[PDB]
Amino acid sequence: AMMNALELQALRRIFDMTIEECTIYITQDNNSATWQRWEAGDIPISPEIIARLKEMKARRQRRINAIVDKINNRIGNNTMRYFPDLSSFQSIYTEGDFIEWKIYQSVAAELFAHDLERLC
Amino acid sequence: AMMNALELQALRRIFDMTIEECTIYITQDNNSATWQRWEAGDIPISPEIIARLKEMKARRQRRINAIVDKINNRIGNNTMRYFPDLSSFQSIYTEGDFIEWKIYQSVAAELFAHDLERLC
């Protein structure tokens, strides 16, 4: 089944992004009007954007899998940085962009919620 | 180690709540300044509040585990309702409150991110 309006809203929250940020980094056209129409279900989501979002979900899962793989393959105090803003993220990942930062943050928050990592 | 400012920010965002909502529904002190200072790391978080946050974290994990544990035996498509506002949430969970709603939504978004449930 085609990605629907509710799932779009859910993804935005999973990645902790505002509609404005989605129009800047995902659709890359600053068109908030169209994005709101999508979340309102007035019109179907552009197939091209669905594909972009699905690749973000995939990147997120691979990131989580990679970290979890290292956790249960080792033992000890697992702690990871949590970056409130992009600049703090770039102090460590000097080549990281906004989307990379949001994916990282989403993963860090989930891992902490599952009691798998402490944040620093 | 006691819960720190970063973990407090992480939980607020995974539950998709604004600071104002946290002051009304979690601390119930209606004082954003206090919460902002906690997220800024200026003042340690009140132990009472840390406890409340850990319980929400525990409730979240319990709901996730309960659902994922029965996915393979579920009859029909793996779909889950996504509720945009508290009122819609209460049309199903008639005794549902703000906190249960936020926790539910967090769980729904995660399961969708993990491709375990489609949202409707």
From TrEMBL, chains A, B:
Pfam families: Aca2_YdiL. One of its GO terms (molecular function) is DNA binding. Signal peptide: none annotated. This is Cytoplasmic protein. It comes from Salmonella typhimurium (strain LT2 / SGSC1412 / ATCC 700720).
